Every structure is written in structure tokens, then in C-alpha cells.
Design a protein around this nucleic acid. Structure first.
Ligand SMILES: Nc1nc2c(ncn2[C@@H]2O[C@H](COP(=O)(O)OP(=O)(O)O)[C@@H](O)[C@H]2O)c(=O)[nH]1
Ligand SMILES: [Mg+2]
Ligand SMILES: [Mg+2]
Ligand SMILES: [Mg+2]
Ligand SMILES: [Mg+2]
Ligand SMILES: [Mg+2]
Ligand SMILES: [Mg+2]
Ligand SMILES: [Mg+2]
Ligand SMILES: [Mg+2]
Ligand SMILES: [Mg+2]
Ligand SMILES: [Mg+2]
Ligand SMILES: [Mg+2]
Ligand SMILES: [Mg+2]
Ligand SMILES: [Mg+2]
Ligand SMILES: [Mg+2]
Ligand SMILES: [Mg+2]
Ligand SMILES: [Mg+2]
Ligand SMILES: [Mg+2]
Ligand SMILES: [Mg+2]
Lengths: 401, 57, 80, 120, 93
RNA sequence: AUAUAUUUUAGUAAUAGAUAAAAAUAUGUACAGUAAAAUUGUAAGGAAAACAAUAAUAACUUUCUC
RNA sequence: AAACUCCAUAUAUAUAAUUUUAAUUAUAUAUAAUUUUAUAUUAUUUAAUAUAAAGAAAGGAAUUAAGACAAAUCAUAAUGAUCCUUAUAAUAUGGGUAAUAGACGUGCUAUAAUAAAAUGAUAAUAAAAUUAUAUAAAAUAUAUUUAAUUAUAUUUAAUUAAUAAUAUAAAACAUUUUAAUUUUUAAUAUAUUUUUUUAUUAUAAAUAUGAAUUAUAAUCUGAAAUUCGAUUAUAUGAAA
């Protein structure tokens, strides 16, 4: 008893997935570029078209945000938060960050900005938004024999596709291969004719490698090969990113069960192990400017692990595996992860946001009409808990109290 | 038509019955028939002798 | 004693004399666990009112004696 | 559609849960163990199963003491209880509650299905 | 009221054509309580049977010569004769 | 071992004996046989259900044998 | 009757070497209101409405008279009369008070998505009360390959208490999941909705509700758990 047009989903899903961004005012806002941050240092800025294209593919813009409020997802540049982070990324020798903060402070948004910057500066981006998919057991998996770990060839395929599409092909096909690669063919065409697909050293490309389509049991092998290729190449920078890394840290054991009925460890998987290797000084990328940018989510569980990894708490040895996994900490220490605290909004920034919202026509009538502007701003600041952006946004729009 | 109990009773009845379970008649050639007769008669004689022996004893 | 450790429940009885010579054992215990040492001994287990004659088979070995002497009468209704 | 060991299954039915629902011998833990042995990802659906996987499941079910055999064990136990002049056996025969309950009022479920031939 | 199987028309066995009921029988080996085997013709399909309770282990037939199991299993550490002697005072009865 | 085709079986049903005192075709003819009671027993079975057993072999024929 | 009374409230004073700390408290002693004042608007100096300025100022408990109902209690206890005195008095062992056709009250749990379940350790936020016929912390072991959870066992740290323990309150709020529901899944492509979209293929009246009833195994208390107790596990999964 359902039509195509009617809304059948729950609220959060509906807001994400039903395009109510359709009925919205076009806004001629400035464009996000790191080279011209001096112009737009503390102003709202729409992303470039190319950036948007890349960012959507990656999975930067998420469901629980209020990206439905505008024509397209929008951020502002911040001197204390985003700009400083970008400068650190540019300058630091290690280039290896974990974006920490309170729930709703704007970690994702920071990640999205970092991705956009990377896109601008001719870099490949391997984004893993929501590791919950590979960590929790809701897709097929298999123990590979060559690689001593469990591969996940539904998730992997999706990730490969994202990598292919998020990045431009000219940058991606500038990379020649280091080794030759045999794979099992899995086209609808040439199934009987071509039993195997072969990629040569100099002739073939990384783009071509990505476009390969194998059976599930070779997909993990393909992924491994791709990563190796990217590590080897020194022509283009590789930005690796993992958002909701908190889940990964806490969920040490996956929901998958091996032959004997017991839970599989995250490092015994392909994806989680690979990710950990990337984080640590192990799969070292040949080029400079090649970063790993991790991000915590307030959604996920909290425990002693991440604080212990960083310069926060001394290592209590007696706390349990559930609330403190030491292997993960050790791995984090190995690859010198310098954490980045996202600061809460200043008064001026809050005011600027409120002004933008007013321009876009999100503010309620009781806020605008018959009220001093400065007083309103002060109230908004108070209700957000002194500049938590999400909370502020909620007070503005989702209050109706 | 019939219950499961009725079916099982019918099956049981069939086990005992000669309906479609029995082979063809044992036909013999005349020479074979004679051979059979000689086998049986000799056997019968032997049995009689044994009975007499035991009886005598 | 129900729990496997500490078990099983034991009571003093005239067992050996019954074993020697078939003299039924009038139990008023009802909470003594039956043992393998008395299968094929005649027991006369109390019912509240009247002692109940039972010959202990090998299926009874785990159970209590009072489980085989049903105290209440089988219920009925006078349809008036 | 997807038949396995005689019991029919609708598609999109999560395998372990479906197994628990249908087969008499198994609950939650047993179904999970079976899935682990066979190597299905948890929350895999019944429609996703290939034919060899189905056969392997069927084999696993056959190896386990389930369905009619499991039911029979329970029946045998109650028959044994009845055989000895036991209180529990007597209760089973008379269709009253067995587990030291009250029956001045509310003993309707027991009356309905405390038989010697229990399950159906 | 009376439960029956209602008869069909009977098949006419002609005089002389009546054949004796030779039922299908297998030669079945019965091993008794002890190792004494005996062959007997039997209608059930089982070439070999071994018996537990026979005349060859019953006291009546030779005067001159699993609840319990469960109990034994779960009261094994205690080892339960000496125990009988300990728990058998014949004063009270 | 497995697939298709062509067949074959499974409709599972009583009498197996010229049946002989349970019940059923009550008139013909041919062939054959003997009932009942009472008594002694035997799982439920009891005065009363079913089944078993309960007069005599002289002479004769055939067979085996001392 | 009201009032004095108690609890709770506001204020003041006292005391507490601010390690028995919670001073944001506890407890003795006061004071405080059955609130006051003024402007108007209706009805006759007052009384209800409204407005204003002054205040922390707004509840609950106990107390339920006379009579009546020959209301309830001789099973809290006692006493009158009357009856029993080897029994209607006294002690032990077991059984019963838990029986089950129908019926009647009180409750509890349910019949799923403005509602159920997993999870949430720099442990979100309470109060009141108990612990020398005790309260039992941490930690080890088993159920259970990690560990947590829950349940037992092991063994008693601390305190007989503003000091330690019962005891990290729970809803809340947040992520995840949820059949009925082809209102979803997964194979392909697809892309500026990517924890997602579109296209084409295949996905065909009690559940992944409920927890009655029963089977087996363990554990707890006790000397003892059969009639007849309480947990945990693996199955069972009515009715609604
Ligand atoms: N920094 C920043 N954050 C914003 C802006 N606009 C909205 N946000 C909010 O940033 C939030 C993302 O915070 P995040 O740290 O991902 O929350 P978490 O997932 O709970 O950790 C969203 O909820 C947005 O509402 C902006 O212009 N800048
Ligand atoms: Mg986040
Ligand atoms: Mg089931
Ligand atoms: Mg203090
Ligand atoms: Mg008063
Ligand atoms: Mg009065
Ligand atoms: Mg009175
Ligand atoms: Mg009266
Ligand atoms: Mg009196
Ligand atoms: Mg009285
Ligand atoms: Mg008295
Ligand atoms: Mg007396
Ligand atoms: Mg009562
Ligand atoms: Mg519900
Ligand atoms: Mg809490
Ligand atoms: Mg403890
Ligand atoms: Mg305390
Ligand atoms: Mg349920
Ligand atoms: Mg129903």
C-alpha cells in the first residue's frame, strides 16, 4: 500500500534520502580553496563542483547532519578549527592526524574540508566513512589462503568503486604499475573466452587495475595489489581517511564467526588489518604529502584505549580488554598520531552562521521579527553550550518549543 | 476414504495375505520329476530306517 | 541434598535385614533418595494415612520414596 | 521458496533465526553454531543461499538430533515417568499442572496440553 | 459404532489351485547372553541379533551356576558392601 | 555417480482348504463329513466370552525292521 | 470544627578545626502568613472580580465527635457463663492448609514501530533506608575464546556506620536492529541523496511479538525441597 512519491522511511532516513533539498533558495556563496583562505577566512563557503562530486562519492556528507536545509552541503572556514588543521597538515613531517572533540563539534565537516583540499591539490583519496559496515557482520566474508586474513568481498567492491569514482581519472591513470597482476575474470562478456585478466608492468595503469572485476575470492587479492601500487607510487599524494574510527578502536572483535563458534578479531580481517597497517609506520607511502586523517564519532562507544594512545592518561594495566585494548594503542604509538582537538565556535562565528541561516531562510519568525540581533545571538550561544554547532543548529531549527 | 490407522491395518493384512506376493508354480521336466521322486523316496526310506533303529534301541 | 555435590539424600533404614529375608521396610521418610543398593526390596512408604506397598524397580533409582505414595485422593465433582 | 530439510522458508528470512523458528531441536545458540560451521556471515538471508550451501545445512541438520527425534525423547521421558507410579507421571496422565502449581484457578494451559503424547 | 474394514468380493481359489502360504523368511543368528549362537528362521530382516536377558543368564534356568546408570554417573566422585553397612541400622522400622 | 527418455512395478484388503456346526444364497445336482452336552485346564476371563483336550484296535493292506 | 502538632518551605543564630564533609550539608533554637496593601468595576460601611507592589510564601500527614449498625474480633490478649479433665489437655513422625467441574473478586504479564530489544568505564542524573540472630567489596574459577554482561562457586577487604558495604539508580538522551511490509534484501550497472539514489533481474492472519506449558542438566537455602521452595542453562514456544 505504498507509492513511489510517498515517504515510507523513518524521520532521519527520510531527511537524508527524500530530496527536500529540492525546494531551497539558490545561494551565490564563495568557493572553498586553501590557496585563497585569506579572502574567505571566517565566512560560509559552498564547495566547488568537482569537490562536491568527489566528496559525495567518498561519503563525506552524512545523514544526521542538516545538509537538507540548503541547496547543497555547506561549511564555513574557521581560523581556530579548520584553517589551523590544514596548516598543520601542510607543514608537519609525519602528516598523521586523529580529529577529536565533543559530539556535534564538527569532525566530519573537518574531514570533508580536508578531502576538498586534497581534491584541489591533485591528490587521491581513499575514504572509509563508517567502518561499522566492514566491522559489524552484515555482508559476506571468506578466509583467504594466500593472505592470512578474512576478506569481505561485498564491502571491498564498494570501496574500490568509491575510490574509482571519487578521484579524477587523469591523476589516477598517471601511475604505471610496479608489478604484473593476474586476476580471475568476471565480466558478462568474455567469460568463456578470457578466463583470466592480466595487467602488465609499464603498459597497464592503476585506473585499469581499479576497473578489474573478479570473483569474490580474488577481490581481496585485487585490493591488496591496489594498496601496494599506491604505496609504491611517488607521483601523486594519497590521502587515507577513516571517520567513526572510535567504533574501530572499541569494536576490537567483529561479529563474524570462524569455523569454530567464536568471534573473529578485527586485525584478523582484511580491511581492519589493512587500515591498521596504513595508520602505523608499515605500509609507508613513497610520496610526501600522503596523509592519514582519522575521525572520532560521539555516536560510538568511549573507553580507555584512545586516551591511553594519546598523551592523556597513564597506562593502567589492570583495566579489561573490553575497556582497554593495548595492541591498538601500541599500533597508534608506532605511527606517530598527533591528535587534533576541534574547538567549539566563537561568538563571532556563531553570529556569522546565524546570519547565513537567515539569508538562506531557515530562521523562524519568532527569532527574526521583534527581537534584537545581538541578544538572539547570545541566546543561541547559551543554548548551544557556548558554540556546539550541531546543538546550535538544533536550537535554531528543530526546537519548536 | 481411509484413516492412517486403517491404512496401517491394511498393510498388516497384506503382509499375511497371498495377494500378488507369490511366484509361479514349480514346473518340472519329466526326467527332473523322476529325479525328485527318487530323492524323496530314498529320503523317506532313510527316515523310516532311522525310526526303526531308534525304536529298536 | 539435591545438588549433585553433597548428594545423595540418605536416611537410616532396616535394609540389610530386608535383603537377608523378605521383610518389607515401613518407611515414614518420604524424602529418602532411592539407591542402587535397594532395588528389588519391598518398601511400605507412608501416605499420611496408610502405608503404601511398593517394589522398587531399576527405573526408580534417582527418585524419592514419597514420589510413589500419592497423598491426596483423585479429585472429582458431585454433579448435582 | 528456499526449501531445506522439508521445512519451507520465505526469502529475506535471516538464516539462523529462520532455523531457530522452524526446527524443533534448535534455538538461537545452536543455529549460530551451525552457521559458523558452514561459514555464513551473520544476518545472511535465506534467499542468498546457493544449492551446495543448502545441502551442507541439510547435512548439518541431519547430524544434529532434531525435529521428530528430539520430540520423541521428550515423549519417551514422560512415558517412563508414567510407567513408575510417580506423581509427575500421574499429573501428566490426568492433564493437570506438573510443576508444583496451584489449580484452584488458572490451570487451563496444563489441561489443554499436559498429555502423555505431548508435542504437536 | 463398531470400527471395521468393509470386505470386497472374495477371490475364488479353485479346488486344486490352492497354494500353501510360504512366507519370506531369513536365517537369523541369535547370540544368547553368553557366546552360544543359534540359527532360527525369522520373518523380520535382521541376519544377526545378540540378546542381553536370556535363559542362559537367568537364575531360574541355571541355579547351580537408564535411571540407575544416570545415578551412577552423577554420584561417581563419592563412589556411593561398606556403604550399606554404614547406612543400615535395623532398630527403627 | 548423476541427467533425460521409454517402460515396469506400488491401487498394498483377508478364503490357499472340496473349507465341514461363527456368521452369510432357504429351490437343483455332484462329492465329502459329523453334531451336542458335560468334564479337565488355560492372559485379562469371573456361573456366563475364546482355544485345547476327553470310548475301543481284534483282524486286513502297504511300508520299514529284528 | 478551627488553632496549637508533625513533615516540607524561607530567613536568622549556634555547632562541625570543611579527612565521619554532603557546608550545594545536618540539627537544635527562634522568626515567618488562616498573608498584606492600594486603584478601579459591579452590587449593597463592606464583598466578589480585575489590575498593581510587597513577599520564599504553595502543599501533605496526624487528628475522623455524639449516637447508631446487637457491624468486625472470645484465633493478639484477657474475663463472665457454659462444656472437656487418660482428654476437647501434652509430645513426636508423616500428611494437609498448595486438592480442582463451573463461578467470583483483586493483581501481574502480555497482544510490536507516537514501541520493543543490543550497546553506552575519564562510568548522565536521585532519594529514602538497612547492615553483632550481620551487609559482603574487590579479585579469581566455571557457564562462555577473547572481555563485558548475567548467574553461581572460591574468599572475606572494609563498617557494626554521616566514616565501609547493600548500590556505577532507571527511565532519559545517542547509535544499531526490528516481522507483519517486493515499505526489504543482493547481482549487475548507475551518480553532485554514496551509513544513500535510480534502472533491470531474482527475492511467494501469531513474528526476529508473547512467554504459558513441559523435558533434561546444573546451582541456592536448609538436617530435609516427593507431595511443596528459589535461581541459571539448553530445548519446549498455549492463549492472546
Ligand atoms: N565545523 C563546522 N561544523 C558544522 C558546520 N555546519 C554544521 N556543522 C555541524 O557539524 C556536525 C558534525 O559533527 P561530528 O563531530 O561529526 O559529530 P559526531 O558524528 O557525533 O562526532 C554536524 O552535526 C553539523 O550540524 C560548519 O560550518 N562548520
Ligand atoms: Mg561522526
Ligand atoms: Mg524452534
Ligand atoms: Mg565539603
Ligand atoms: Mg483539627
Ligand atoms: Mg462517632
Ligand atoms: Mg457486635
Ligand atoms: Mg453480631
Ligand atoms: Mg470466654
Ligand atoms: Mg471461634
Ligand atoms: Mg486465649
Ligand atoms: Mg490432645
Ligand atoms: Mg490459602
Ligand atoms: Mg513490543
Ligand atoms: Mg549510567
Ligand atoms: Mg563483586
Ligand atoms: Mg558509605
Ligand atoms: Mg520472544
Ligand atoms: Mg492462537
Amino acid at each position: 500500500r505504498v507509492t513511489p512519491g510517498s515517504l515510507y522511511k523513518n524521520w532521519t532516513n527520510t531527511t537524508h534520502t527524500a530530496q527536500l533539498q529540492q525546494t531551497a533558495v539558490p545561494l551565490a556563496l564563495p568557493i572553498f580553496n586553501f590557496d585563497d583562505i585569506s579572502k574567505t577566512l571566517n565566512k560560509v563557503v559552498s564547495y566547488s563542483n568537482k569537490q562536491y562530486k568527489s566528496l559525495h562519492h567518498l561519503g563525506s556528507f552524512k545523514k544526521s547532519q542538516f545538509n537538507e536545509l540548503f541547496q547543497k552541503p555547506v561549511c564555513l572556514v574557521r581560523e581556530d578549527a579548520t584553517n589551523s588543521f590544514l596548516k598543520k597538515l601542510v607543514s608537519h613531517p609525519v602528516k598523521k592526524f586523529i580529529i577529536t572533540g565533543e559530539p556535534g563539534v564538527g569532525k566530519t565537516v573537518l574531514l570533508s574540508q580536508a578531502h576538498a583540499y586534497a581534491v584541489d591539490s591533485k591528490q587521491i583519496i581513499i575514504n572509509i566513512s563508517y567502518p561499522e559496515l566492514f566491522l559489524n557482520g552484515r555482508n559476506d566474508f571468506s578466509y583467504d589462503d594466500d593472505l592470512k586474513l578474512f576478506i569481505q568481498p561485498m564491502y571491498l567492491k564498494k570501496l574500490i568503486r568509491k575510490i574509482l569514482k571519487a578521484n579524477d581519472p587523469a591523476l589516477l591513470k598517471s601511475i604505471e604499475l610496479s608489478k604484473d597482476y593476474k586476476f580471475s575474470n568476471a565480466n558478462p562478456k568474455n567469460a568463456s573466452v578470457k578466463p583470466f585478466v592480466t595487467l602488465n608492468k609499464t603498459k597497464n595503469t592503476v585506473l585499469d587495475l581499479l576497473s578489474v572485476m573478479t570473483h569474490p575470492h580474488n577481490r581481496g587479492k585485487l585490493m591488496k595489489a591496489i594498496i601496494d601500487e599506491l604505496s609504491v607510487q611517488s607521483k601523486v599524494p594519497i590521502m587515507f581517511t577513516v571517520d567513526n574510527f572510535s567504533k574501530v578502536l572499541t569494536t576490537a572483535y567483529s561479529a563474524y564467526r570462524n569455523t569454530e563458534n567464536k568471534q573473529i578479531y578485527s586485525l584478523d580481517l582484511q580491511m581492519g588489518k589493512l587500515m591498521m597497517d596504513i595508520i602505523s609506520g608499515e605500509t609507508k607511502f613513497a610520496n610526501g604529502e600522503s596523509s592519514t586523517i582519522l575521525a572520532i564519532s560521539g555516536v560510538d562507544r568511549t573507553n580507555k584505549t584512545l586516551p591511553v594512545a594519546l598523551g592523556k592518561i597513564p597506562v593502567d594495566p589492570y583495566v579489561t580488554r573490553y575497556h582497554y585494548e593495548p595492541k591498538f594503542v601500541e599500533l597508534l604509538q608506532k605511527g606517530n598520531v598527533t591528535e587534533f582537538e576541534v574547538p567549539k565556535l566563537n561568538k563571532q562565528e556563531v553570529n556569522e552562521l546565524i546570519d547565513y541561516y537567515k539569508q538562506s531562510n531557515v530562521l523562524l519568525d519568532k527569532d527574526i521579527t521583534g527581537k534584537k540581533w545581538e541578544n538572539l545571538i547570545d541566546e543561541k550561544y547559551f543554548l548551544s553550550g557556548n558554540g556546539n554547532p550541531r546543538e546550535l543548529l538544533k536550537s535554531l531549527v528543530l526546537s519548536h518549543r | 476414504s481411509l484413516s492412517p490407522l486403517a491404512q496401517r491395518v491394511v498393510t498388516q493384512l497384506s503382509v499375511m495375505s497371498a495377494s500378488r506376493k507369490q511366484p509361479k508354480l514349480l514346473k518340472l521336466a519329466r526326467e527332473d520329476l523322476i529325479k525328485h521322486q527318487t530323492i524323496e523316496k530314498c529320503w523317506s526310506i532313510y527316515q523310516q530306517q532311522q525310526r526303526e533303529r531308534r525304536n529298536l534301541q | 541434598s539435591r545438588s549433585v555435590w553433597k548428594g545423595p539424600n540418605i536416611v537410616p533404614l532396616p535394609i540389610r535385614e530386608a535383603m537377608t529375608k523378605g521383610t518389607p521396610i515401613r518407611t515414614n521418610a518420604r524424602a529418602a533418595t532411592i539407591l542402587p543398593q535397594f532395588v528389588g526390596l519391598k518398601f511400605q512408604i507412608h501416605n499420611g494415612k496408610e502405608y503404601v506397598p511398593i517394589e522398587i524397580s531399576e527405573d526408580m533409582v534417582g527418585h524419592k520414596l514419597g514420589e510413589f505414595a500419592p497423598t491426596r485422593k483423585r479429585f472429582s465433582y458431585t454433579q448435582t | 521458496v528456499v526449501h531445506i530439510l522439508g521445512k519451507g522458508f520465505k526469502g529475506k528470512e535471516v538464516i539462523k533465526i529462520a532455523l531457530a523458528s522452524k526446527f524443533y531441536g534448535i534455538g538461537k545458540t545452536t543455529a549460530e553454531k551451525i552457521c559458523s560451521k558452514l561459514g555464513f556471515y551473520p544476518w545472511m538471508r535465506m534467499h542468498q543461499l546457493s544449492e551446495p550451501q543448502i545441502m551442507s545445512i541439510a547435512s548439518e541438520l541431519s547430524t544434529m538430533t532434531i525435529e521428530g527425534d528430539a520430540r520423541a525423547i521428550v515423549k519417551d521421558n514422560i512415558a517412563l515417568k508414567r510407567k513408575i507410579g510417580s506423581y509427575s507421571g500421574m499429573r501428566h496422565t490426568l492433564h493437570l499442572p506438573v510443576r508444583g502449581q496451584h489449580t484452584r484457578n488458572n490451570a487451563k494451559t496444563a489441561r489443554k496440553l499436559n498429555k502423555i503424547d505431548r508435542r504437536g | 459404532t463398531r470400527i471395521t474394514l468393509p470386505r470386497r468380493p472374495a477371490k475364488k481359489i479353485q479346488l486344486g489351485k490352492s497354494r500353501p502360504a510360504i512366507y519370506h523368511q531369513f536365517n537369523v543368528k541369535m547370540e544368547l547372553s553368553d557366546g552360544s549362537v543359534v540359527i532360527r528362521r525369522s520373518q523380520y530382516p535382521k541376519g544377526e541379533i545378540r540378546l542381553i536377558q536370556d535363559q542362559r543368564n537367568n537364575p531360574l534356568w541355571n541355579p547351580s551356576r537408564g535411571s540407575l546408570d544416570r545415578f551412577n554417573k552423577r554420584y561417581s566422585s563419592l563412589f556411593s558392601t561398606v556403604e550399606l553397612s554404614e547406612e543400615n541400622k535395623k532398630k527403627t522400622q
